Nucleic acid binder design. Structure first.
Length: 213
DNA sequence: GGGT
């Protein structure tokens, strides 16, 4: 089930998909050309769908019925991904890929083979020259604005606080969801320098997860 | 399961 095992699987174009293939016997490369809203009727059964384009400029509908929130945040129009674990299913004269089991994988092609999500420590972060990294740190200061959140994060390997800037797209979904002294994973941020003090910044690939501890 |  390793990532490298999943990337092993044969890549297929829309014209090659068959209903009789096992959901995990292939992987599909797709460019997101359209992303719907999340739909919600019931106390908890949200869905959404995207339109993905392949290398023949053909387009196919992908529906997501589980792990909806995470996947909705991952998928951005314009980006290329590998999708693994979807059921090829008939869609009225068409085929579609249907993601229902919550063990499917959406792998962004761009960050493929990078240490961006390597999850190091603040004192380390403040020492290492990577440009993309991830910290499990604690929020000790919050300056929240119209379009931008400035944080100061700290950890137990230093007495220094790290400065973190969060920009439009990702900040909206976080404007007042930060708690002081709570613990968060800052995945795939951008090491950067202003005043020979080192800001972390987010970009299109960044994510944030609240350590449940 | 569900459905644009």
């Amino acid at each position: 089930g390793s990532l490298s095992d999943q990337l092993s699987k044969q890549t297929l174009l829309i014209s090659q998909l068959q209903v009789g293939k096992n959901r995990f016997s292939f992987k599909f490369e797709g460019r997101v050309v359209y992303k719907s809203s999340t739909f919600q009727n019931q106390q908890d059964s949200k869905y959404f769908f995207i339109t993905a384009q392949d290398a023949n400029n053909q387009e196919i509908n992908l529906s997501f019925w589980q792990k909806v929130d995470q996947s909705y945040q991952t998928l951005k129009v314009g980006q290329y991904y590998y999708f693994i674990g979807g059921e090829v299913k008939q869609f009225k004269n068409n085929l579609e890929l249907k993601f229902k089991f919550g063990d499917y994988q959406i792998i962004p092609k761009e960050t493929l083979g990078g240490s961006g999500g390597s999850t190091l420590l603040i004192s380390e972060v403040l020492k290492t020259s990577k440009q993309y990294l991830s910290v499990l740190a604690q929020v000790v200061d919050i300056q929240s604005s119209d379009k931008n959140i400035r944080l100061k994060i700290c950890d137990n390997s230093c007495n220094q606080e790290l400065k973190v800037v969060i920009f439009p797209d990702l900040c909206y979904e976080w404007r007042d969801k930060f708690s002081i002294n709570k613990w968060y994973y800052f995945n795939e941020f951008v090491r950067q320098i202003y005043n020979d003090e080192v800001q972390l910044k987010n970009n299109i690939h960044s994510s944030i997860k609240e350590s449940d501890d």
